[PDB]
Amino acid sequence: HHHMLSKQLFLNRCKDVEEYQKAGHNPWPHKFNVSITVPEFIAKYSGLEKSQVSDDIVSVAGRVLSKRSSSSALMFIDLHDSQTKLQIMLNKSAYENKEDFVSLTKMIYRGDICGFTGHPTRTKTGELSLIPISGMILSPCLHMLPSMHYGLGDQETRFRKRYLDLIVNPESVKNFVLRTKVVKAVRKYLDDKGFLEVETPILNTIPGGATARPFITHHNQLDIQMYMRIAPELYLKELVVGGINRVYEIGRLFRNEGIDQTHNPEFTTCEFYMAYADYNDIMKMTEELLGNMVKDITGGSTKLEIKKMVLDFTAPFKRISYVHALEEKFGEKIPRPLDGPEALTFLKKQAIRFNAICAEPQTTARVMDKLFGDLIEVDLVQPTFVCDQPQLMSPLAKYHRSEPELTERFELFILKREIANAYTELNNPIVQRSNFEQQAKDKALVDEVFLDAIEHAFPPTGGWGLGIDRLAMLLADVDNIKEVILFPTMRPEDELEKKAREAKEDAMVAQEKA
């Protein structure tokens, strides 16, 4: 008989509650006035010591994670609020309503949300506590909360029921608080620099020239097929055309592709565009911003990740040129026209020499990308900008102002992976048109609106993009993106894994009762 005991416990718990409601007690009261939060409590009354009782009358509320008593007239409750704990010493002699004292002290179940009003104290055991004059059930818990900790690992039982995870693994909250701290740090930095935070469409009537598979939907009244955005770039750029010099958007993007530890179907990035700025300015800005972030997290620009290891966000960051690093380790330089014959015939040599086996098709772009990917990326642990990618690698970028066959852009690598990137955006409408068309033919309708917009003179502009989820990952020292996303996209379980899950869920309980 499938999950026999937890059904039994749910039913008996509902019973307990409604009989507690006839008994005269409203299990879900409308308002309990909380005079102080338990972190504030700890901050205010830590100066107390053993057996010393404050004269104050404060009221707190949270979730019971421990109910244990050494006597019928003396109970000890671990109440949890904002991921910190305060003990509740329920002493009968100190409780006003002796009749209610009993009823409350029996009805309380582990998991119940409770409120208590009483005197701050520190017991003879050193444990900071509150001695209630009056308490009340604020919301009864109808299920057995898992032990503490539970779900380490087995990530799916955690992420499917995030509300349980945050309770039994409170440390995980530290992660999300970091993430918010990140986005704020971004916004502030940009806002203080005259940027206008805006909102551009998520639904588009044009799929975009990007190769990534988009989520596809349909608008009924207009009877048209629409697509979810892959990036806000075009609209933002149209805003810079429109006269808003500095714009930014921290938005939700959508890719209908695979799901792994670094990919979620819907993710969050930050893009900004800044008129009359080049990728150098954006580099300094990036150093500045990430710097301030890390120095909030710690105090110095140096962080420590996983035993230990240090990540030095001290300005300036390392920076290297692409083809200059490839030529730095190949032996000597590379043939001119990089997209040419001699350069590919040359590339293949180190693409059989340096333990590098490239793939098919063997495009110059591909052998160059793999040679840089296995070879140069490997020991890029410290924050470093890889700059001046070739036109071979950069279709929609602007040519480098000095040295030929290169472009003005960079990719910020930290800990083997790409965190952010920037460009001296291409503002040539003719070239942009050619590239857009050539792109559309390559993937075989183009965004003529945007082409028109930039045809109305798009100012020299610096573009920047940051992976919010991945930056959060890197700063929380986690290797799974679901660790920095509250409700990551889960494959809906059928009744197989469901049945197994519940079955184990009883295996625990039967392990207790026997």
Ligand X SMILES: Nc1ncnc2c1ncn2[C@@H]1O[C@H](COP(=O)(O)OP(=O)(O)OP(=O)(O)O)[C@@H](O)[C@H]1O
Residues 153-212 that bind a second copy (CB under 8 A): 160-167, 170, 173, 176-177, 180, 183-184, 191, 194, 196-203, 205
Q: What per-residue string of b and e applies to 197-229 under the rule 16 or more CB within 10 Å gives b?
A: eeebebebeebbbeeeebbeeeeeeeeeebbbb
Residue 154: CB minimum distance to ligand X, A: 22
Known binding-site residue numbers = 255, 263-264, 267, 470
- Backbone conformation region of residue 16, classed left if phi is above 0, alpha if psi is from -120 to 50, else beta: alpha
- What is the C-alpha to C-alpha distance for residues 208 and 214, in angstroms, rounded to an integer? 9
Token pair listed for 309: 């290891």
What are the binding residues for ATP? 255, 263-264, 267, 470
Between residues 418 and 497, which has the closer beta carbon with respect to ligand X?
A: 418
Asked if 213 is part of the footprint of a second copy (rule: CB under 8 A), the reply reads: yes
Report in angstroms how near the CB of residue 502 gets to ligand X at its nearest: 31
Taking CB under 6 A as the criterion, the residue among 135, 208, 467, 488 binding ligand X is 467
Q: What residues from 97 to 116 belong to the interface with a second copy (CB under 8 A)?
A: 111-113, 115
Cα separation, 379 vs 374, in Å, equals 10
Nearer to ligand X by Cβ, of 21 and 489: the residue is 489
Contact yes or no for 90/74 (Cβ under 8 A):
yes
Q: Return the residue matching tokens 């083997």.
A: 416
H/E stretch holding 69: strand 58-71
Cβ atoms 285, 503 nearer than 8 A: no
Nearer to a second copy, 241 or 392 (CB): 241
Report the Cα 160 to chain-centroid distance in Å.
Answer: 16
Helix (H, G, I), strand (E, B) or coil at 390: strand
For the bound state, the minimum distance from the C-beta of residue 186 to a second copy, rounded and expressed in Å, comes to 12
Number of neighbouring beta carbons within 10 Å of residue 93: 9
Place of tokens 């990551």: 488
- Beta-strand ranges (E) seen in 351-451 are 384-387, 409-414, 417-424
272 lies in the site for ligand X, by CB under 6 A: no
Find which of ligand X, a second copy, none residue 492 binds, CB within 5 to 8 Å per kind: a second copy
In angstroms, the CA 277 to CA 289 distance is 16
Q: Does 408 bind a second copy (CB under 8 A)?
A: yes
- Spatial contact of 268 and 252, defined as CB atoms under 8 Å apart: yes
Q: Nearest distance from residue 483's CB to a second copy, in Å?
A: 14
Q: Which of the listed partners (a second copy, ligand X, none) does 218 bind, with a CB threshold of 5 to 8 Å by partner kind?
A: a second copy
Q: Is 444 helix (H, G, I), strand (E, B) or coil?
A: coil
Q: Which is nearer to a second copy, 298 or 428 (CB)?
A: 428
141 binds, among ligand X, a second copy, none (CB under 5 to 8 A by kind): a second copy
- Smallest distance, a second copy to C-beta of residue 428, A: 5
Q: Any contact of residue 482 with ligand X (CB under 6 A)?
A: no
42, 60 in Cβ contact below 8 A? no
- Contact between 269 and 467 (Cβ < 8 Å): yes
Instruction: Report the residue from 95, 101, 267, 372 that binds ligand X according to the rule CB under 6 A.
Output: 267
Identify the H or E element spanning 106.
helix 98-107
What type of residue sits at position 403?
A: E
Q: How far apart are CA 422 and CA 411, in angstroms?
A: 7
> Residue 267 or residue 458: which is nearer to ligand X going by CB?
267
Whole-angstrom distance, CA of residue 372 vs CA of residue 393: 12
Q: Which of 50, 242, 309, 310 binds a second copy (CB under 8 A)?
A: 242
**Residue range at the interface with a second copy (CB under 8 A); choices 123-131, 241-249, 346-354, 473-481:** 241-249
Assess whether the previous peptide bond of 316 is cis (omega < 30° from 0): yes
The residue count for the chain:
514
CB of 368 to ligand X, least distance (A): 16
Residue 418 touching ligand X (CB under 6 A) = yes
Note whether 140 binds a second copy by CB under 8 A: yes
Largest Cα span, the chain: 94
Question: In terms of CB distance, is 264 or 321 closer to ligand X?
Answer: 264
- 214 contacts ligand X (rule: CB under 6 A): no
Nearer to a second copy, 337 or 459 (CB): 459
Q: Which does 470 bind (CB under 5 to 8 A by kind): ligand X, a second copy, none?
A: ligand X
Nearest residue (CB) to a second copy, 383 versus 467: 467
Residue 424 binds a second copy, judged by CB under 8 A:
yes
In the complex with ligand X, the residue whose CB is nearer, 32 or 215, is 215
Q: Is 467 in the site for a second copy (CB under 8 A)?
A: no
Window 307-336: residues binding ligand X (CB under 6 A): none
At closest approach, how far in Å is the CB of 482 from ligand X? 10
Segment 246 to 265, residues that bind ligand X, using CB under 6 A: 255, 262-264
Q: Which residues of the chain form contacts with ligand X (CB under 6 A)?
A: 255, 262-264, 267, 269, 418, 467, 469-470, 481
